[PDB]
Design a protein around this ligand. Structure first.
Ligand SMILES: [Ca+2]
Lengths: 137, 137
């Protein structure tokens, strides 16, 4: 059971870009065939969809990630991170509770597939019911 | 880029025990103060609760985990695992759909804290909406 940094630098860049509000930096970390596995949702393929997804998030939420742990990996083609999402609910996300600038804080995690240093798959996990409880009410 | 070896394979033992249906083996991987995060509002602490929880699972589901990838930190105090859950829904779990021996397959992920080689925290995520869709079919 050997572990190393693998392609973790890409994962670091990705999250750093997120915290900077830099979608361009995030997109730069992704392969053209990127499969985004939406929590409690569907699988969205490609950068056009990803950019749209980011825009949507940018409208609804203002967030910063803290307590970031990017795990050592047994395989350069895989990665994992656990962290804390801190945010403000700026504008109502369709189907979710009404936004009134609620403050929230939630544990989260992400798993990835990589190919040659680019993320080919991203799966983000968090407890949606927990979040809903915080913003409802 | 250097490597390290995680010699104490507590996480692997834990999942191996799970697969073998050996709750004793799972319990042995945990600290007396283990915090089982079902959700924010519901953190079950200790081995008595965990054993009851396994009995509950044992009643409702039969599952095997495959495609296991385990991640670590150099200090050995944090870990993550991504895998595939393959099961049969044996008996109804309160608030979930009716059990009819439906088969299901879905990805899942777990995050752990460890101290002195024992699991002190366990959190597991998966696409619940997807699961519900699968068993409702
Ligand atoms: Ca046993």
């Amino acid at each position: 059971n050997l572990y190393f940094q693998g392609m973790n630098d890409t994962i670091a860049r990705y999250f750093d870009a997120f915290n900077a509000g830099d979608t361009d930096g995030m997109l730069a970390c992704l392969s053209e065939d990127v499969a985004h596995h939406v929590n409690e949702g569907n699988i969205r393929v490609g950068k056009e969809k990803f950019a749209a997804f980011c825009a949507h998030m940018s409208h609804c939420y203002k967030e910063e990630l803290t307590d970031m742990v990017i795990f050592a990996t047994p395989d350069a083609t895989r990665a994992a991170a656990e962290y804390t999402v801190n945010g403000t609910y700026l504008a109502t996300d369709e189907g979710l509770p009404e936004a009134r600038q609620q403050s929230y804080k939630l544990p989260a995690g992400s798993f990835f597939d990589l190919r040659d240093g680019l993320i080919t798959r991203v799966t983000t996990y968090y407890n949606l019911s927990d979040w809903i409880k915080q913003v409802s009410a």
